[PDB]
From a paper:
Here we report the use of single particle cryo-EM to identify multiple proteins from three enriched heterogeneous fractions prepared from human liver mitochondrial lysate.
The first enzyme in this pathway, ECH1, shifts double bonds from positions 3 and 5 to positions 2 and 4, isomerizing 3,5-dienoyl CoA to 2,4-dienoyl CoA. A total of 8862 single particle cryo-EM projections were collected for this structure. Similar to other members of the isomerase family, the N-terminal domain is a spiral of four turns. Each turn is made up of two β strands followed by one or two α helices.
Residue numbers in the entry:
A (entry chain A), B (entry chain B), C (entry chain C), D (entry chain D), E (entry chain E), F (entry chain F): 48 to 328
The structure:
C-alpha cells in the first residue's frame, strides 16, 4: 500500500494507521547505500509530504539488516575524484554546487512541518547520521550503532553531521571524540548521551512503538503540533529574546483556530483527545 | 512574616534566614492555577526583588499538594475564544499584546539579577514549566512531574517553554518527544535529562535543602554572584567571542570592589566566607 | 625529549609517539599555579603548535599531585588590588586590557586547528576549568574534581568559564549550581554531566589512554581532522543554516586533496588507515 | 485642546486634525531642557499613545525658540557626580540602572507602532538628537542644527545617539566627524547627509507640512501602516533572509483584513483613499 | 534571437553582445503586470542563468511605455480575498506558503552569482521596486519614478521592499516617508538618494549604457566578478569580523585560478583586460 | 622628529602639535606600494599607538605624488602564484594564513581606540581603499580618486574593501558599480557618495585641516573620545537593542571619571574645552 503519490526506486512510502506516513529506505541489497538516485528522491518525497494535508507524522526506518551503510563511494567517487573545471577555481564552484544540493536533501526533513521520527536498527554509518540528526525524535534498537565515517573516508562532514550533532546532544566532549576518531557508538552509549530517546530490544518492537508514537502525535491538533516544531526549530537558531518575539507573531494567528475550541472542550470534559477530529492542515 | 513590601493575593513572599526571599505560590485550593491576577503580580513582585538590595537569593515553591496546575482555562478562555477586534488583523494585534504581556511575567524572573531556585513538589503542568525553566536552579521531589500541556490545550507554547526548555537540557530528542505528545515526565526521568539538579524524597526535605542552597549563595559576594548570572545569561544567547568581549567590559568595573579584597583575605586565611560581611547591592 | 623549539619554565612540551605533542604544566611545587609567566608562555606555545606541520594532536596534562591550583593570587593581587590609573575610567581601561590578554591565553587553544585532549588528574580549580573547557576532549581520573573558584575569590569568571562551560554540557541547572556556589564536582558527577568523556582509575592509565586517543587521531587525514574542528567550532557559534553554508565554502577546496584518494583506496581495501601516510599540513 | 488623557507638566499633547497626535515639548523658558520629570513622562506618554486606537500618526515638535537644549546638567549632575554606592561596583550597578531607564525613554518612541514625525526648529543639541533619531521621519527648518554635545559634556552618548545615528544615514565619515568633535551641523548640511527628509523656511511652514504628512499617513490603512513600521524596524536589526521570513509570518494574519478589500475597491475605482474609512486598530 | 533555452510568455531573454543576457519583461499591453505566470517563470529563468556558464552579466529592462505596473490585482485578488482553509489558522498556513513562494521570485535574482543590472524607464510601481532592489546596479531614465504602492493596496510590502530598500540607500528618513505615504519618487530625487547610480535622457540611451556596463563586467575575470558579488552580499548580512573570516575561507580556493596569472600578466603589460580570454565558469 | 619609538623603513611617524600622531607612508619612489615589509610594520606601529597614552588622534597621509599605488604585485606574486603545499588542500591552508595576516594589517586600525583620520592626495588604488575604509574620518584633495583594482588584478577584495566599503556609504548601487568594473571614482563623486567628509584644493590645505581636526579631537576628553569610537564600531556590527545594552555596561564605569567633572565645569563657565587638561589614558 503506497501513498500512492510517492513512487520511488530507492524509497518506499506506505501509509500506516491514519495521518501517519512511513518513509522506508528500500535498498536492502546495497544496505541502503545513498546513491545519486537517493539524494534527489528524498527532496521530491519530503516536498510532497509537506504539501500533504492528511499526513501529520512521519516515521523514517530502513529495510534489510541495517538502517543505512552511508554514502555510496562508487557513485560519489566520480563527482569528487573527477570534477569538472579547467582549474581549481572552476572546480570549487562545481564542488560547492554538489555539496549544497546534497545538504538540501536533509534540510527538507527539517523544513517539513510534520514531525519526523527516526527508527534506527542495525548500523547507521556516515551520512546516515545526518539523516537521523535532522529528525525530531530518534529511536534505536539494541543492536544499532552510530558512526561518523566521514573522517575515515577523508573529508569533513559537510552534509549536516558537524552542524546538527553538537546541537542535538549536550555532551560536546563525546561529539569531538566521535567526529575525530570515527568510532562506533553503540545503542546503550547513545541513550546515555541523549542522541536517542528510547532503546528497544529489536526492530519489530522499535517500529511498533515508533508508529504508536506517531499515532499519538497525529491525535493532537495539527495546527498546534506543526506550530510547535516551527518554534522549536526557530528557538534553536536564535536567542531567547528573539524567539519569544517570533512566537508572539506566529501565535497571534494560530490561536484563532477551531482546534483550540474543541481541544479545550475535550480537556474540560473527560473525552480523550483521540476522539475529537480536526480539520486538514 | 512577609517582606512586608510584598503583599499579593496569589503569592506569599516570606523572608527566610538572611538575604533569602521565599516566593511561594499561594492558591492551594485552585492548585496554584495561573489566573489573570497571578500574571500581573509576578511582574510586580520580581521588579521589587530586583530593586531589593538586601535580597541575594530567591526560592520559588508552591503551596498545597502540587507546585502548579498550569494556566487557568476558565479565565483565559475569554481572552482567546472571545477576542476584541472587528476582523482578523485587529484580533491579531489584540492577541499579540496579550501574549507579549504574559511572556513578560517569566522574563522578569530571568532579568532578576538575584539567582532563582525552583522547588517543585507535585505536578508542574503546562505554563508551570515556563516558571521553572526561567529559574537558574531547579529542584524537585520524588513525586514531581513536568508536563507541557500546551499541545493538549490546542496551542503551541508561546510563554517560554519552547524557547528555554531546549536551551536548559541537551537531550533535544526528549524535548521534541515531550512537546509533541504532552506526556508527563516523572522526577527520575527529569534528573537523567538534566532538567533538575537534585531529587529529594518529599517537599519538606527539598524545601530545606533549597533554602540551604540559597543561604550558601547569599554568603558569597553579591557583586560576584549577580555578575555571574548576567554573564551566564548573556553567554547563552551569544557566541563565545562576543561573550568574552562582554565580560571584559562588564568586569572592568566590577573588579574594583571591596568584596574582592575581603574575599581574598578570607580565602588566604582559614576563615570561612560566611563570616565576612559584604555591602548591600 | 623536548620539541625542542618549545622551551618554557612553566610548561614542558615533549614529543610523544608520532605527530602527537604532550604539553605538560610544569610547576608541581606550586601545584601548577598560573603565574604571570604561565599566561604569556601558553600564547607563545600554542602559536608555534599551530604553525607546526608535523603535530596533529595535542594532549594537555599536569605534573605533580594535581592538574592545577587555579590562578596564583599572590602575583595577580597586584594587578587587581593595585591597578594603574588616576581615576576609575583610567583603571577600567587598564583592567580591560589585562582581562583581554588573559582571555587570549585560552583562545589560542580553541583557535589551534590541531585537536586538544585534556588529561585531568587531581584537582582542577578555578582558572583550570577554562583550560580544560577550551579543550576538544576532556578526560579525568577517579580522584579528579572540577571547581569554579572564581566566586569564592570574589569575581565573576572572566577568562572563559562562564562562556564555554554552559556550551560544553547540557545540564544548565548544574552549571548555575556550580558557578554560584563554587562547590567541587567530583569525577563521577562530572562524567554523568558530560564534562568529561571517560574516567580512569588513576593518572597513569588516563595518560596512556589519552595518548592512545591522540595517536588514533594522528592516524587520520590531517586535512579532514583539522577541517572537522574548524566546522565544529563554527557550528557552535552560528545557526545551522549559516554553518551549512560555511562548510560548503570550506570543503569546496579541502575536497581536492590526495588524502581523499588514499583514504578511500584504503577503505575500499582491507588496509588500516594507520598504514597510509599523509602529507604534512 | 488636550488628549485629554495626556496631561503632563513637561509635554503638551494636542489632538490635531483626525487620528493625528501632536506631542509638543513644553518648557520654552528652559529651552525644553530634559529634566528628571521629562524622562518619566515620555515613557508614560508614548505608552498611552500605543494603546490609543484612534491615533494613527504622531508629530513631535518643540515650543519656544528651539526644539531642545539637550540634557539638563543641573538636575543630572547629582545622579552622575554624586552616585549611590559604597565602592565602584555598587556605583556601577546604580549607574547602569539610570542609563537603562533613560534609554527606555527613547525606545518607546521606536516601539510605538504609530509613525513618529519630528519637526525640528532651532537648535537640537545633545540628547535631543536621540529624540529625533528614534523618529521615523525627520523634518527641520532653515535655522535648525543638530549637535552631539555628549563629548563636550565629557561622556559618550549612551542614550541612543551612537546606536541609531549611524543607522539612519549612510555618510559614516560625517557621523564620526560629528561625534568626535561635537560640532554643529546646520540644516543645509543635514539635508545633504540624509538626516532630515525636507527643509522648510521656518517653523510655521515646517509644522503645517509635518501635520499634512501625518494626515496623509492617517488616511492610509492603519493595519498596513503599523505593519510597515514593524517590518521596517525589524529589517534594520536583522539580515534580509531572516526579515523575509519574519514578514511572511507577520503578514499571514494581517492580510486577512477588511482594509485590503476596501483599499483595493477604492484603488480599482477612482475614489481617493481618504474617503474610505477604516476600523480602529 | 532568444537564449534559446529561455522561452517564456511573460519574459523575453535575448543574448546581446557576448556573455551578456538581456532579460526583458514582455507584457507591454498590461504594462508588465506581474500575473501568476510571471512569478514562476522568473524562478525558472534565473535558475537557468545561474547554471549558464557563458553568461557573465544580466540586464533587466521592460517593454512598452513603463518598466512595470506592479502586482496584477485581478489575478492576485483570488489568492488573498478568497483563500483556502476552514478557519484562520488554516488560512494563515495557506497565505504564508503563497508569500514565501513570491519572495523566492526575487531571491533568485540575489542568489544569481552573475551581476544583475536594472534599466528602469517609465514607472516602477509596487512590486517592481522589489525587482530592482534585488538588482546589484540600478539605472533609470529621466521619466522613471519609483513608488511603493503596497500601502495603498492595503498591505505591508512582504516580497522584499521593506527588507532590501533600507539596505540599499542610507537616507532612512526618505525610506519611511516613501513606504508610509506611497508617494512617487521621480528619477532626479532617486539619484540624490542613491537608489540609482545614473540617470539617462531616455530608455534608448539608458539601455545602451546599461549593456555597455554589462560588457565591461563580462570582460573581467568571471571568478573575480562572481566572488565579488558573493562576498558583497554576505558582508551586507553579517558583521565585519565574520565577513573577513568568510572571504578568507572563500578566497583560499578562488586564488588558485588561471585568471589571476593572465590578468596580472595583462596588467603588467599594456594589454587591455578585454583582450585576454577567460575560461567558462 | 620621530615618535621616536616608531622607526620603520616603510612608515614615518612624526609627532605633530600635541597628542596627535602623523603616520605617513614613506615610499614615494614606489608610490607607497604595499610590499611585505609594509604589512608587518603597520601591525607593529598601530599596536604601539594603542598602548601610547599621550596619543589621542592619528592622521594617515602619504608621501610623494599619490597616497598609495595599491598592492605590490612583484612581491605578492610569489605568495599567490607560487604557494607552498603538496596539493590543493595544503595550498588552501597556506593561502588562508596569508589572507588572515594581511587582514590583521587593517584590523588594528579599526581596533585602535584613538580616532584615525585619512588624508588622501593623488591616487588611492586597490588595497589603499582598505587603508582608508578602516579609518574613522576620510579627507581627500581635489585630484584624489579611489579605485578598487582587485577585480582587474583577478581576485576579489579579501583584505577589507568588500567588507567595510558597503558599510561606510549608503549608495549600494555605486558600491557594486565600483567593485565590478574597477573604475576610478574622482574626488567630487566621492564627496557626493559620502566616502569622504571634505574635499580640499590640494594636499597642503588638506593636511593642515586634517591636523587641525585631530587637534580638536585631542582637546576633548580622551575617555569620552575613546569610548565614543568603541561604541560606534560596536553599533555597526550589532543591532540597536544589543548596542544599547553594551553602552550601558560600558558607560557604567567610564562615567566615574574626573573628565566629567572638569568638562561640565568648563561647559557651565565660559572657558573653552581646549584650556582644561585631562589625564593620560
Amino acid at each position: 500500500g503506497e501513498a500512492p503519490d510517492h513512487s520511488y526506486e530507492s524509497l518506499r512510502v506506505t501509509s500506516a494507521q491514519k495521518h501517519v506516513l512511513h518513509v522506508q529506505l528500500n535498498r536492502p541489497n546495497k544496505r541502503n547505500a545513498m546513491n545519486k538516485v537517493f539524494w534527489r528522491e528524498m527532496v521530491e518525497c519530503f516536498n510532497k509530504i509537506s504539501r500533504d494535508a492528511d499526513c501529520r507524522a512521519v516515521v523514517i526506518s530502513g529495510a534489510g539488516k541495517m538502517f543505512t551503510a552511508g554514502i555510496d563511494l562508487m557513485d560519489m567517487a566520480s563527482d569528487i575524484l573527477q570534477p569538472k573545471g579547467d582549474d581549481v577555481a572552476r572546480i570549487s564552484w562545481y564542488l560547492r554546487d554538489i555539496i549544497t544540493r546534497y545538504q538540501e536533501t536533509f534540510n527538507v526533513i527539517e523544513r517539513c512541518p510534520k514531525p519526523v521520527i527516526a527508527a534506527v536498527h542495525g548500523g547507521c554509518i556516515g551520512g546516515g547520521v545526518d539523516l537521523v540528526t535532522a529528525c525530531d525524535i530518534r529511536y534505536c534498537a539494541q543492536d544499532a550503532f552510530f558512526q561518523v565515517k566521514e573522517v575515515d573516508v577523508g573529508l569533513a562532514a559537510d552534509v549536516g553531521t558537524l552542524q546538527r550533532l553538537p546541537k542535538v546532544i549536550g555532551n560536546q566532549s563525546l561529539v569531538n571524540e566521535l567526529a575525530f576518531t570515527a568510532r562506533k557508538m553503540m545503542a546503550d552509549e547513545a541513550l546515555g548521551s541523549g542522541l536517542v530517546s528510547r532503546v528497544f530490544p529489536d526492530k519489530e518492537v522499535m517500529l511498533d512503538a515508533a508508529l504508536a508514537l506517531a499515532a499519538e502525535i497525529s491525535s493532537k491538533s495539527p495546527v498546534a503540533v506543526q506550530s510547535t516544531k516551527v518554534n522549536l526549530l526557530y528557538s534553536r537558531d536564535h536567542s531567547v529574546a528573539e524567539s519569544l518575539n517570533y512566537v508572539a507573531s506566529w501565535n497571534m494567528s494560530m490561536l484563532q483556530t477551531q482546534d483550540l475550541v474543541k481541544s479545550v472542550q475535550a480537556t474540560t470534559e473527560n473525552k480523550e483527545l483521540k476522539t475529537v477530529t480536526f480539520s486538514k492542515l
